[PDB]
XYZ file of N, CA, C and O in Angstrom:
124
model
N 115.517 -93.954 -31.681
C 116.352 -93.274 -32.712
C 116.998 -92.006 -32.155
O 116.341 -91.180 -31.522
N 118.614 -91.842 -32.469
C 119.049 -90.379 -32.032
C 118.498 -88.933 -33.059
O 119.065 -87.923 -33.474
N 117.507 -89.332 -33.138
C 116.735 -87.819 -33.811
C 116.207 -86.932 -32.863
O 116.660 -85.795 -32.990
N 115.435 -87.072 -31.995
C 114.988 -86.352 -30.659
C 115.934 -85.947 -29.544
O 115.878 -85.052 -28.700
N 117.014 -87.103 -29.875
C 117.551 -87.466 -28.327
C 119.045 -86.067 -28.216
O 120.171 -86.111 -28.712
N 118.511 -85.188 -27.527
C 120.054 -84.320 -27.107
C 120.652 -84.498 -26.358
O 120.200 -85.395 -25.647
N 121.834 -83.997 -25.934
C 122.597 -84.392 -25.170
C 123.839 -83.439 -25.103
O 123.745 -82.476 -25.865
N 124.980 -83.504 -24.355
C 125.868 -82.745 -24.649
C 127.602 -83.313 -23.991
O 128.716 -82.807 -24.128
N 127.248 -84.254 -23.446
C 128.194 -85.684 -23.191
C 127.899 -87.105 -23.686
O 126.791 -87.612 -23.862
N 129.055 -87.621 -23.865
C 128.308 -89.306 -24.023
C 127.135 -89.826 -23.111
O 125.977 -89.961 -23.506
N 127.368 -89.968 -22.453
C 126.358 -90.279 -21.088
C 124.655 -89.479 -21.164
O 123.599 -89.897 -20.691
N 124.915 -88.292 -21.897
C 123.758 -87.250 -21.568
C 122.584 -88.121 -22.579
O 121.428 -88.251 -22.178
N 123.020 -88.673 -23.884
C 122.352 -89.347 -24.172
C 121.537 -90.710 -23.881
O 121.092 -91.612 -24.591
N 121.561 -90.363 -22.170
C 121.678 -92.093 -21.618
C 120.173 -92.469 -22.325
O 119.965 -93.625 -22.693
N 119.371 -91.646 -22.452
C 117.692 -91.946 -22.828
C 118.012 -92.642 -24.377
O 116.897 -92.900 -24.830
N 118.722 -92.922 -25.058
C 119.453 -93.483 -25.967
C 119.358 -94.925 -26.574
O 118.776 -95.668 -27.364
N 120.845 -94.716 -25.164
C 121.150 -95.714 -25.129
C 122.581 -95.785 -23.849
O 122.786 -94.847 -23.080
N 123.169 -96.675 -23.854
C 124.474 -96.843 -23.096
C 125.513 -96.189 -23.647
O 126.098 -96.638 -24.633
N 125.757 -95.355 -23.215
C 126.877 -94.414 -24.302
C 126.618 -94.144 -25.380
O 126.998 -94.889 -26.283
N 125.948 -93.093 -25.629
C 125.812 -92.839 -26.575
C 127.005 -91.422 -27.413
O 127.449 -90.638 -26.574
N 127.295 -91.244 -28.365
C 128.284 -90.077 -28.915
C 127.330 -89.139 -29.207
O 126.494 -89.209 -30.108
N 127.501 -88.167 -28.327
C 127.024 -86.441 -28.657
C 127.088 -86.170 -29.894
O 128.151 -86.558 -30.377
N 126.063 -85.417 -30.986
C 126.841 -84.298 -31.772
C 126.628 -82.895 -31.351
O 126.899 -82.343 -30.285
N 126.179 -82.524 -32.241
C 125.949 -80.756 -31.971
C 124.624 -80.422 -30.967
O 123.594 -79.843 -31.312
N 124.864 -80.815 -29.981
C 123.494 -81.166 -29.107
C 122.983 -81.979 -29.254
O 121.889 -81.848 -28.705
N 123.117 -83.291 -29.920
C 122.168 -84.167 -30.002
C 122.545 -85.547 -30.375
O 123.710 -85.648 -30.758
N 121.880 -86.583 -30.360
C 122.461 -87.964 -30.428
C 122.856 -88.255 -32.168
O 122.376 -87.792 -33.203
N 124.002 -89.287 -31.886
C 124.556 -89.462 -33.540
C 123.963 -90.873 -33.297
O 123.197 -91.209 -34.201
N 124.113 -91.754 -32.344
C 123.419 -93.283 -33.021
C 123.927 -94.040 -31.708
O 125.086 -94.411 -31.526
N 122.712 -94.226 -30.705
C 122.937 -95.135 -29.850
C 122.566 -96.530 -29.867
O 122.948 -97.078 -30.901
N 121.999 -97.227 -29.133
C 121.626 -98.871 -29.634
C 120.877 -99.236 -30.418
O 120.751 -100.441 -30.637
């Protein structure tokens, strides 16, 4: 789930998923 997952590029969320979309530091919804 993108609840934990931060990030600050698509990619940064790779722990995600495969592209994932950044929000405000943190994952909006990867796979």
């Amino acid at each position: 789930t993108p609840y934990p997952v931060n990030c600050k590029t698509d990619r940064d969320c790779v722990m995600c998923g495969l592209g994932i979309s950044c929000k405000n530091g943190y994952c909006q919804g990867c796979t």
